[PDB]
Design a protein around this nucleic acid. Sequence first.
DNA 1: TGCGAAATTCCATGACA
DNA 2: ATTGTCATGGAATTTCGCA
DNA 3: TGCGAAATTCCATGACA
DNA 4: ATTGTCATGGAATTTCGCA
Lengths: 368, 368, 184, 184
Amino acid sequence: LDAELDQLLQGHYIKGYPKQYTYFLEDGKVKVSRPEGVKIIPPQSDRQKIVLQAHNLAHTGREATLLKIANLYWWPNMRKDVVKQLGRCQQCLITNASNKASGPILRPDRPQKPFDKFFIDYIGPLPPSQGYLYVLVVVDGMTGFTWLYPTKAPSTSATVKSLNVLTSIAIPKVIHSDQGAAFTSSTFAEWAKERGIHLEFSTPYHPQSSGKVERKNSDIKRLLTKLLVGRPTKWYDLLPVVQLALNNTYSPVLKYTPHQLLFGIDSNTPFANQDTLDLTREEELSLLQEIRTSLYHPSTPPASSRSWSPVVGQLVQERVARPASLRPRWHKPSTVLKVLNPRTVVILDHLGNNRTVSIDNLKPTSHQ
Amino acid sequence: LDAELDQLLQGHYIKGYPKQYTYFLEDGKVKVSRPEGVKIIPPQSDRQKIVLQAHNLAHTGREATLLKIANLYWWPNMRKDVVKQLGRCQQCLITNASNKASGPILRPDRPQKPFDKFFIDYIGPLPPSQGYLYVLVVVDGMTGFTWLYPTKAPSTSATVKSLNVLTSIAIPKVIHSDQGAAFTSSTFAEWAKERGIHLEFSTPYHPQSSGKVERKNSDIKRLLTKLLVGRPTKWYDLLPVVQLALNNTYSPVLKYTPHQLLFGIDSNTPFANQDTLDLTREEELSLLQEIRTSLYHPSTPPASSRSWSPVVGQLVQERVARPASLRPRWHKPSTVLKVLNPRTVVILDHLGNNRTVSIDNLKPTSHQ
Amino acid sequence: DRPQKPFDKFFIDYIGPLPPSQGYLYVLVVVDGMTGFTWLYPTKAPSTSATVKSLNVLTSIAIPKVIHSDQGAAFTSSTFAEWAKERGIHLEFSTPYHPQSSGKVERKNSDIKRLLTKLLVGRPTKWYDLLPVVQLALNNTYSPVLKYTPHQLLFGIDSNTPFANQDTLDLTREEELSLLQEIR
Amino acid sequence: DRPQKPFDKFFIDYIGPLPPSQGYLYVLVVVDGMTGFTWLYPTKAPSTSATVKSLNVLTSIAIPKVIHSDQGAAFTSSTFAEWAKERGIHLEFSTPYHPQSSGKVERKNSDIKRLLTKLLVGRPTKWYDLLPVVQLALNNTYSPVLKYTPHQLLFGIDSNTPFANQDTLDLTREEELSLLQEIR
DNA sequence: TGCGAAATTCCATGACA
DNA sequence: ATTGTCATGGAATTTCGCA
DNA sequence: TGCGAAATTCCATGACA
DNA sequence: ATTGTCATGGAATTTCGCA
Ligand SMILES: [Mn+2]
Ligand SMILES: [Mn+2]
Ligand SMILES: [Mn+2]
Ligand SMILES: [Mn+2]
Ligand SMILES: [Mn+2]
Ligand SMILES: [Mn+2]
Ligand SMILES: [N+]
Ligand SMILES: [N+]
Ligand SMILES: [Zn+2]
Ligand SMILES: [Zn+2]
């Protein structure tokens, strides 16, 4: 402030202020002659106010704020003071975008057996067909084998009615879904506990987590579209055909159809594979056990050159789910309690609740 | 057919059918013993039907269709027949996605002078503020200098009222816009012809083409959001502040504000730059002429490893604009009449109309 | 001859009429010959159309080469024949009054009839909801001849619902007296 | 002393009352001192509030260091003073009855008054729509003293609307007789 | 122990949300 | 308390048919 | 004719549609 | 008949202050 700046005018050396420049008084203010020109040196006690006034013109980041300040002022390590303010500006912190990418995706292991894990999800609404608007899709994680049910709503009740029909065949250890209303209800929880089925939920607003079934929705819609070209969109009667068609389609990378992965033998459908005609069922089941274990498994891709990975105690911000018009896209900063895996964390949302959250819905808070 | 297959059973050599394998008759059909197993060799006259039946089960692509066929059959160069059918299947051609990326973007030259080119566009609708729902944004291409007008609708009439006010200052050579209803109307055309202003339109559904103003919309909304944190979204009264705030904000890559680029001198706003205080206006205008010409210009980025560039006479497909539920995302194939530049083409949309179109809304038709 | 396989042959039959349950009166019974795996479908009638409606569900999961049945009206109609011809399914009928299936299939049908009657008592009307659990029981029941359950043979794995308590299946004293009371 | 610059000083004044045009009666006139660049704003009254409303538009494009005006009520009110103080604009008044601006500014105001009267005749009522073109004319008019137009000095480029036909600006015989007819 | 063509495998691209 | 996926069709690489 | 720190420049990321 | 753009904040690179 006035103390530090005084020792300077008399020509003695202060750390930070280079000695090779000449500092004078003029118009009631301490000045300095620098290559770019003559700038005012404000007292340390004035500096926060200045950085703030410059930042507030358009809520600019580091350089654009600096460039305003440097028009009139100089002092040691200006950017350090600029960055101090950016790190405390609520409005910038919750409105600006991130410029760091998420770390590279995980490729979770394929479930070892059929019925180990189901992925479920709704498609729709669709143009009304026989009063129906939605399709429940259930995908067996190991095999890809998929079941389709038309419904009038994406409700718990319609979910239960269809799953009662499907579980006639077999009960799965785990059913994975997103946090849709149909799956998080207490009625659906009872229905699963009643049966020894464990419910697994995706982190919220992260359909990549239900990727197995989302991806199957693409094939379902794509085949439905093709079959409906130049006809009215009467899809109800085609669900059964599409289900059969997709369950018997080869995956080029696997060289197997999901039907084959589930049963180890084609049924009476066109172009049935005949290679195991001379094996006994038991020999067939033994070759299927071997086929199941040696399926191609993708590996985690390279990190992008500017990614971040979460660290316990880091300040991070959760993306606002359905942000209103002209409202921030980010929540206030919160703290990483636990790193479940490099792509998943528990945060204290500073209310404070524990939330389990994908890093894709997180940015690391800027300026520490 | 029956002719070609006969010469084979008697043991003479036909081109395509390897001589080292043994071909026999059984159950009324020509067969062959191959490493994988014994397959039927259909007569050439049966083959189209077979490929078709296999493809039609789930409208599968090359390998997945092949794998069905190879379960029962063998013949020379099967994939060639598979690919022949895929290239003729309307339903696959108009529903499947592309797997080739667009060629690398162009970085058009920055307009040489202020007023050479304006980019205009609407933001909204926004939460009602004083009865207003939209903002007209006008961005000078050379300087970035931006004008903002609140409107009740994105109409021609409101466009004209605001541009009459703006053109009080200066008339631009060119006004670039997208194909919005407000800009393509005959009333707006008359209004521009009346003034010696040339209208330039983006290719349809390609806002990257209005990138200059789209990008400015981001800053406008971002600053509006910050200023409205924890207050009701009363944005009308802030347009003037935001306009001033952004026109006087530095671009870090340029080291200039748009105001500076337009006038070569700051006005009475906070942190006004003072470097040209000792120059005459004329000296100032001469330094500005030099500053304008030496601004950083970005270069075209590297092509991605699997891109396509349009070639005259190529079959290509335009993306359907607003495709209905369960309907194809692509139009029927059409022909490239002219390559305007590597990212822009004229196609005969086989009705046939001439359309000028971005390659981002095109895929190259598959299987030639 | 080639070894027997799942989907080689489905054995179908109707059971009923039963007491009404949520509007349903019959059960179409489908048993895979090689595995002994059972599917059950509630119907309102033993008609061709109820059969087609139910088999359309099953045949969206897996198609048999041959369907075997007695000469019930539902299975001998020309509609049902047209249906099978359309799916490349060969039909096969036992000669009238002489039902022949196979030992494994015969025993399974006995189990089904007996297991149904067991729980159809005390709750003659709530069997619709019980069809799922009935099937799981039937399909996770050990086969004396083979070392394996139908589930194991169909899918090649253990199931998450083994029915370890191989049950009585006979009618207790209270059930005999209240089956004689309901059938009064 | 440092050379004169655009935005150093804006000279403002009211012209009117005029005949009604789309509800407007006056013109606030703003002339930049260094460049001679003119902005015009239609108002309904020569009041502080009409002045503030108009200057708010202009001061969203560029802010002057000093505003100069006569001692009109609109400019001497304490509201207008509060307004300028808020924007760091110093106010400057000519002494009453002695309007002083500058040679360049004086001539410009003469041009404005004369150019207005010229087209305000035959169409005394349609001037609202003409304000844009009036300004373009005024701003792309060559300055005898300087080699440059206000447009050129403000923006440092030629404009796309040069007014090459430096016009008569005087009233023809038909206009004098019909200005004497309108003012009857 | 090598060549030309065919077959198979690789893998970026995009779409499911 | 959890986690992306995989059909697609040109290109790159491997295998086949033959000497 | 070189060192440590500060300043400046680079540039991937994402959001406007 | 046309065509992406540029604020942002860590990291990489250059410059500054001093001997
Ligand atoms: Mn969902
Ligand atoms: Mn638009
Ligand atoms: Mn019977
Ligand atoms: Mn006056
Ligand atoms: Mn979904
Ligand atoms: Mn837009
Ligand atoms: N895993
Ligand atoms: N260009
Ligand atoms: Zn801020
Ligand atoms: Zn097809």
